[PDB]
Amino acid sequence: ITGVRQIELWRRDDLQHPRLDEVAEEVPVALVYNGISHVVMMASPKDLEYFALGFSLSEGIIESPRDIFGMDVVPSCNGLEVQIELSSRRFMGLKERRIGKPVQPLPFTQTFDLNKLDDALRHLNDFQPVGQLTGCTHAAAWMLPSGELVGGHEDVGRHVALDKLLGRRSQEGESWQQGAVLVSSRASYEMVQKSAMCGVEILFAVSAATTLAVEVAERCNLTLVGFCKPGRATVYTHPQRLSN
């Protein structure tokens, strides 16, 4: 199963007999826009096309996925590269800025009944096969106003995991939209910045948030909920969008 490796190790009790357990892969991945290596991110070695797409929108390197005319995932020395053919307009924009594109306040369009949230919380797992085996993954899911988790993606690192989902949803155009993002991690200012960039109005994080995170969500008109556990949830910003 992709992302997982069977490794030899020792339990604290038996330093003389090695055992096997599954460990999660963490390959370095490089996003290469028109030959220029923009970033190397450690990632689970799957859903890289989605990651590449997601990351492009997230960081505001593109406005549309139509801004990309090619994507090939290639092996390298360290690990993997996603070779991305990019609009001259957007490439120059990236060269120039040398992310930081502007965020821009969100509209109020989305609603969410917090009663539908618990069920979604119990199903985040369904998108972490390696997390399940391994304990080393985070996931990011898209949840419709219904509460239904339409799809989701895991990763060794929470941001890459979010980027992948953002990429996913970027490709499910229309039928998705609406809804919210569910994330297994803590919510960091960059996570909310990315979400907002991609038109996400509500973000549910399973753990804590930072001062800066909530401050950013205020100026973005993004609705930030943290400590989302079955029976709990704490909203830091723009509660206007949620019901009981």
Added chain:
Amino acid sequence: ITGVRQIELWRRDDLQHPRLDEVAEEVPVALVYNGISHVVMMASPKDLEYFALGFSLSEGIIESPRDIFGMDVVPSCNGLEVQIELSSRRFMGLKERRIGKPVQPLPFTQTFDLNKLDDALRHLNDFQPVGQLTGCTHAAAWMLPSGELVGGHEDVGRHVALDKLLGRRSQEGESWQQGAVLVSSRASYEMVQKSAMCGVEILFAVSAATTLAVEVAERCNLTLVGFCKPGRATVYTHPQRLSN
């Protein structure tokens, strides 16, 4: 209390009456070597001198803390900068490489009785005042062969937290050394790379590790233990150094 902010929010049950809770600060900090901004890292707004030092050794920007002739922490727009005066030799080395210094296999010098570990596990908390209040911190502690936690530092992000401890220990010269590092997080390849750089032979991580992490620890002769919880611990590499 530094690092903490009292913020207004809403519990899932009461979207009409705001309450207060403590949230953790996440200021952007820039490490500025001789006027050149090398990195911006999000961090808890304390122990920045230690962070700056730690990070320098970690990344191999310096060999000794004697390589630094000045450190001033200054406020800015985003947040904070640590202005670092650096050896011409080491500065040029950093300019040139434009981390990646060589790691170099560790010697076998350290031992640890896993029986002394549980107690240390119960005391990691003692180094997260904001973690305690907030749930948003990670910590990195130095544990002597004794099992005694001599000191420790928390942060919003695990790496910065480790860097801070590495900085700390870099300043406790001699009396520390020996021992091991205890970390509240998952162990990532960069965490082990940093530790090794600073002469740490044993690393205890409270959570999972990645394929790459353990692979790196093999070539570094670093002893990597993960899933360290009271009564548990799982060693991925060089068990030679530990007893039962």
